[PDB]
Structure 1
Amino acid sequence: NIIIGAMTALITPFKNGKVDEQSYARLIKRQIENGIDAVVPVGTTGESATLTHEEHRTCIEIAVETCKGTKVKVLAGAGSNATHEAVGLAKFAKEHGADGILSVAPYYNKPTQQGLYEHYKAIAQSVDIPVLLYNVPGRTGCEISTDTIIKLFRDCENIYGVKEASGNIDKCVDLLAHEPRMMLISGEDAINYPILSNGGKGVISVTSNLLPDMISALTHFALDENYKEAKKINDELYNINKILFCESNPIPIKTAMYLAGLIESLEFRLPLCSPSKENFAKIEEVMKKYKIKGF
């Protein structure tokens, strides 16, 4: 039981300091109609850190209810750097009808590999839906080592893979050479194709908020091993893939979504804020080179 393919880390639009629930649903429908296989509510791109527990529940519910009747799945953001909370969020995600959960490695308190193992073991035992690990040491301050990922995959039936955001293709080789049964997922848009061509089985994308049809086609080409076409799209997307991180995600992608008229208000919750005017200009310029689908 897995969740793979072309996936989108959904932005959370704000209007007057509240979550825009109609817009959120409209953005999700747009992803569905462009060939996305799953959506990820309240991940990093969705500003998970600044959303209350109830806004958390609301976004997941909207995702679950919008994807009903389609083949698109809901991979819910549900993680924490306190295990008792991560377990609680996992349970709530399951209850809200999520198909599975994405669970980030504990940030800031830097647990040991043993602590990481016990953390994810607690979570995976608490629910009977698929759990995808998420490694992003640049944000968390810690790494889930290759050994710990493989142990967790083998010891817990519902832990089925890992989202990697670590800019380390050696590790991707290491992982799939020693445990080829796991689902490696790209969490780094610029290198979607290299991760996929080495046996990765999906992406959880930032760029796909803006260009869902391009990311969908990239992933599906790759899954069918049509690597010429997949590489072509990956090479085409490189500039937008890099510029969407000229400042910390999701600041550029929300700026881009706003400039494309896909969201009403360029609002963040502090400590996140509008990009510098310089980067705002860079994002605008790069956007001109791409064909953006509306609703």
Structure 2
Amino acid sequence: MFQRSIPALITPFTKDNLIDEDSFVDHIEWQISEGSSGLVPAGTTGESSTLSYEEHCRVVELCVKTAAGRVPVMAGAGSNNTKESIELAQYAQNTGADALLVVVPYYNKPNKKGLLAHFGSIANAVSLPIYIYNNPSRTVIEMDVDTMAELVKTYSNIVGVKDATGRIELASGQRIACGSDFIQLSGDDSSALGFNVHGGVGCISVTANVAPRICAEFQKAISEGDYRQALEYQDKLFPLHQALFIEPSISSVKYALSRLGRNVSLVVRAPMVSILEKETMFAIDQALDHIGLCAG
């Protein structure tokens, strides 16, 4: 259901700090037309941390309606509060999302029993498929392979992982412990190539916001087994992947999209800031031009 290049969509804001709904709808249409295979609204890259409950729901709602069944929608339902996750998960189901992305809780650092209680409570509260989002670089704690396998064995609708660890040996361990039917998606653009050869089938991607067509061509080469061609795309994309997280990727992606002529403002919500260093903007501009993305 979810495979190849799946953008973790930005949430564009107006000059007055409201949701820029027109810009968001335009962004989704453009992503679909350039070859993105699925959509993740209201995730980390969507600045879900700085959305209200109502805005978060509206972002998921708009994405589902705009996709109109052409591509599947995996709604962000991540929280460090299980009660809030269930409410976001039930909202997404009732509005027509195809699946849920649920991050390992951040800041309060549950132990293994807490991870089982968190993901099990969410799984019992909806019937949608659930992807575990494992990202210790943001959550500190890491779900281990034993816990992940127990959850897959216990709950039929825990079906996959967004693995942002960048340690691709874990993809082998997850494939063996959880089964080859467990759906593994890379959560790290720069290692998504090797992640797929270890058993992944796609990437929930930051860079796809900015370069959706090449990102899709890259994942298509992989799924066709043309790994020589996939490595050519990797060499082209790698500098952009890297330049987009010199500073926080939220503001770097919006900077790049604005520069490319997309109708996306630079506005982000504190504690993100839209001011980038000149050296950062230079690195992004050079990586964009290497790929050849400026229409002008």
TM-score, length-scaled by structure 2: 0.95
The answer for the alignment partner of 2:207 in structure 1 is 207
Structure 1: unaligned runs, 5 residues or longer: none
Matches of residues 198-277 of structure 1 in structure 2 within 5 Å?
A: 198-274=198-274, 275-277=276-278
The answer for the alignment partner of 2:293 in structure 1 is 292
2: CA distance, partners of 1:238 / 1:279: 15
Q: Which runs of 4+ in 1 moved over 6 A?
A: none
2: CA distance, partners of 1:53 / 1:291: 39
2: CA distance, partners of 1:263 / 1:245: 22
2: CA distance, partners of 1:293 / 1:118: 48
Contact 2:12 / 2:267 at 8 angstroms: preserved in 1?
A: yes
Deviations 1:171-227 (A, max 9, x none): 122211333221111010011110011110111011111111111111122122222
Matches of residues 11-90 of structure 1 in structure 2 within 5 Å?
A: 11-16=10-15, 17-70=17-70, 72-90=71-89
The range that moved more, 249-258 or 120-129, is 249-258
SS state of the match for residue 204, structure 1?
Answer: strand
Tell me the percent identity. 37
SS state of the match for residue 6, structure 1?
Answer: strand
Deviations 1:118-161 (A, max 9, x none): 10011111111110000110111110111111111121111111
Matches of residues 54-203 of structure 1 in structure 2 within 5 Å?
A: 54-70=54-70, 72-179=71-178, 180-203=180-203
Deviations 1:41-76 (A, max 9, x none): 010001000011111111111111111142x01110
Amino acid at match of 2:3: I
1: CA distance, partners of 2:237 / 2:287: 10
- Structure 1 vs Structure 2 CA RMSD: 1.4
The answer for the alignment partner of 1:280 in structure 2 is 281
1: CA distance, partners of 2:264 / 2:236: 28
SS state of the match for residue 23, structure 2?
Answer: helix
Structure 2: unaligned runs, 5 residues or longer: none
SS state of the match for residue 6, structure 2?
Answer: strand
User: How many residues are aligned here?
Assistant: 292
The answer for the alignment partner of 2:9 in structure 1 is 10
Shift of 1:108: 0.3
Q: Does the C-alpha gap of structure 1 residues 286 and 151 become closer, same or farther in structure 2, counting only changes over 3 Å?
A: same
Amino acid at match of 2:34: N
TM-score, length-scaled by structure 1: 0.95
Contact 1:3 / 1:100 at 8 angstroms: preserved in 2?
A: no
